[PDB]
Amino acid sequence: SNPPPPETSNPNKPKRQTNQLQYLLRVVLKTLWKHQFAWPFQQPVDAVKLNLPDYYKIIKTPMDMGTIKKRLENNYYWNAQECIQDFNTMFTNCYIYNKPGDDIVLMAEALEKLFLQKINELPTEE
Ligand SMILES: CN1C[C@H](CCn2c3c(c4ccccc42)C(=O)NCC3)CC1=O
């Protein structure tokens, strides 16, 4: 079976709307989401349908862009570093779980290149 997804709603978690978080949605998430290699990353890994019974034995902090998109749209975060960490966890999980050089790793690398480019120009806090 699959685990429950990561949390995307929590009324007692303090949160904010900030210009850096707005950039993470409007620039970072949107750029990666529209990419031709986004599809395997647009929702939690479904280890049942994809026949990956060891996935959640190895990956203990799952993360995906569907979860990030919900967190950004629902104003889940306090700061941009929490969201940047989610993206980095997503990429790292893929490199940890998969065999080097597999298609999925090349896909992650292409998305990560764009991510790094956009994060390099994260705007100053207003
Ligand atoms: C973020 N995700 C979603 C992947 C699911 C299974 N899946 C695998 C590959 C792949 C390529 C395209 C689409 C799905 C693919 C692949 O190239 N090698 C084996 C596992 C595993 C992973 O970490």
> Residue 2 class from Cβ within 10 Å (0-12 exposed, 13-18 middle, 19+ buried)?
middle
Rounded distance from Cα 122 to ligand 1 centre (Å): 29
b/e string for 4-32 if b means 16 or more Cβ within 10 A?
A: eebeeeeeeeebeebebbebbbeebbeeb
Q: Hey, whose CA ends up nearest to atom 10 of ligand 1? A: 104
Q: Hey, whose CA ends up nearest to atom 13 of ligand 1? A: 40
Q: How was this structure determined?
A: X-ray
Rounded distance from Cα 99 to ligand 1 centre (Å): 10
CATH number of 18-122: 1.20.920.10
Using CB distances shorter than 6 Å, the residues near ligand 1 are 40-41, 45, 50, 94, 97-98, 102-104
Say what the resolution is, in angstroms: 1.2
Written as six digits, the tokens of 117 are: 């480019």
**Sequential DSSP letters for the chain:** -PPPPPP---TTS-----HHHHHIIIIIIHHHHTSTT-GGGSS---TTTTT-TTHHHH-SS---HHHHHHHHHTT--SSHHHHHHHHHHHHHHHHHHSPTT-HHHHHHHHHHHHHHHHHHTPPPP-
